[PDB]
Terpenoid synthase (Orpheovirus IHUMI-LCC2), 275 residues
Amino acid sequence: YFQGMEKFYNQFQSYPLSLHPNTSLFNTKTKNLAQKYGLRYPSDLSNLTGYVYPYLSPSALQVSNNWHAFLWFLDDKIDDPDCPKVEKEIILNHIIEYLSNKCKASHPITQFLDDEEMWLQYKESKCRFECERQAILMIQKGMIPKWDKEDYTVHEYEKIRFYDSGCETVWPLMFLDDGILPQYGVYTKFGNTIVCRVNDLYSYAKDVYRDKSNYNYFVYYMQENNCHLDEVINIVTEEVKNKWHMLKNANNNTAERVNYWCLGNLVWHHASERY
């Protein structure tokens, strides 16, 4: 595992920007908003925002960090093994209802989203509506199926993880300073895959050895294909190499910003004590 990760990171680490993005101001504002509703956003997560959106304005970075905080709060609750299952179903259906204009925000997570400071001057932006549309899909096609499912093929995991990861909800943030939506298609899909492969690789030790969770590409691939971890790491390295080249070779604004997101996500995981 350790040698496989070393070889993987050495192959793909090509983050050209500062290891010290300016994050303090937006970290503080996001945490202040979280604390207003009794929620916690760990400061290290703000570094990810700084790494992945280095081309955004300060106000767009602020709202992006707020959206990442929403995803963190929800993942924290849904992935919590000690949270009662009925409470998870209640919060997931409530978020859908709130995001569908059917009910008031009545839980801390939706009160956070409903606050004037959530979206700042971007409350009526195309981004806001698309983030929320994609968050409904993340719940309906990602989180709800996952919390009812025990067995996964690799392909079933890939479909559920595409939604459950929330990556489709972050692509619109890349266009906050432009007022338009991303071009969804092969490049957002490749970005979703690259982010998830990196995340699953870095979380493998915690998932398998510490948390005893099977929800990880490498676990399901090893089961399905009867192979060892080193082999899957090699296979994923080849897949990521090909898809990341395809992302970098497109002269297309969505692909270019997805590339930054994949590069920044890799540097953040390399630096993190979490893994």
Notes: The chain is about 70% helix and 0% strand. The radius of gyration is 18 Å.
